[PDB]
């Protein structure tokens, strides 16, 4: 299957006093491996997976330098964007940045992205060709002109197609034990009688990795979305994920219903029945 490396950056202004709160997190697929938090004591990029800890001081110095530079760029942007939108100097505002690269099953470049938002709304984003920009409003359109004159896309493309993929491949190999392992969902069904005439069947998927999963209900061999509930996939906190789907059924007719589980770790999809 495909793999990805993604970085997420959030800066939140604190105009009463001091620099913005800045939090950076790096992921390979659904595994967090590094973090920086401006409120933490180290002021260093910190490891959050065992397979990145082996990287030497040159790596950690470099990552710390670059992530701090990101924070200062965001600090500048928060100041100027407040000015463009004629917002008060008292209120808190947010810049968010996400970028990264996907590779296919062959570990070769599939796609890259670089997206930027102000106050939770699209501002500017690199298009899929990595040679052009999507600017949401006129502030961002002026930014596009600036970044086109400065050849930003070319340099970002070099990173996303090259550097990003090279380091992703390094991480995938170094973290093979966990990053290349698939944990198939551990599945079971529960039953709750809400009344004499109504019952809820809940189909559970636990302890799976990666997070991508599909859970669907059928009745008498055909799909059913009517009277179903599907919760958002959620972290277990040990690196794996959880999900469930429920269907409300007539009491005594539980055997008609089947839960179907699709996941990378399952060679063929699983079927559960009460």
């Amino acid at each position: 299957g495909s793999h990805s490396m993604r970085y997420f950056f959030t800066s939140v202004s604190r105009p009463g006093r001091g620099e913005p709160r800045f939090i950076a997190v790096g992921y390979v697929d659904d595994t967090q491996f590094v973090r920086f938090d401006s409120d933490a004591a180290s002021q260093r990029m910190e490891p959050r997976a065992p397979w990145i800890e082996q990287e030497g001081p040159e790596y950690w110095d470099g990552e710390t330098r670059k992530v701090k530079a990101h924070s200062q760029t965001h600090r500048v942007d928060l100041g100027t964007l407040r000015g463009y939108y004629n917002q008060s100097e008292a209120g808190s505002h947010t810049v968010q940045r996400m970028y990264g690269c996907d590779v296919g099953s062959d570990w070769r470049f599939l796609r890259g992205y670089h997206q930027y938002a102000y106050d939770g709304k699209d501002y500017i984003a690199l298009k899929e060709d990595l040679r052009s920009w999507t600017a949401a409003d006129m502030a961002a359109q002026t930014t596009k002109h600036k970044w086109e004159a400065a050849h930003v896309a070319e340099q970002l493309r070099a990173y996303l197609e090259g550097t990003c993929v090279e380091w992703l491949r390094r991480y995938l190999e170094n973290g093979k034990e966990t990053l290349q392992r698939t944990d198939a969902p551990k599945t079971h069904m529960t039953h709750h009688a809400v009344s004499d005439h109504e019952a809820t069947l809940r189909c559970w998927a636990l302890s799976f990795y990666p997070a991508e999963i599909t859970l669907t209900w059928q009745r008498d061999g055909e799909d059913q979305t009517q009277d179903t509930e599907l919760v958002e996939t959620r972290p277990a906190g040990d690196g794996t994920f959880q999900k469930w789907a429920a269907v409300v059924v007539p009491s005594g007719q539980e055997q008609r219903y089947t839960c179907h589980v699709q996941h990378e770790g399952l060679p063929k999809p699983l079927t559960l029945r009460w």
Binding site: A24, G26, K66, A69, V76, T80, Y123
Partner: peptide
């Protein structure tokens, strides 16, 4: 491995 974000790449 984080991007080398050049100083000129602010929005304004």
């Amino acid at each position: 491995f984080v991007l080398e974000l050049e100083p000129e790449w602010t929005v304004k």
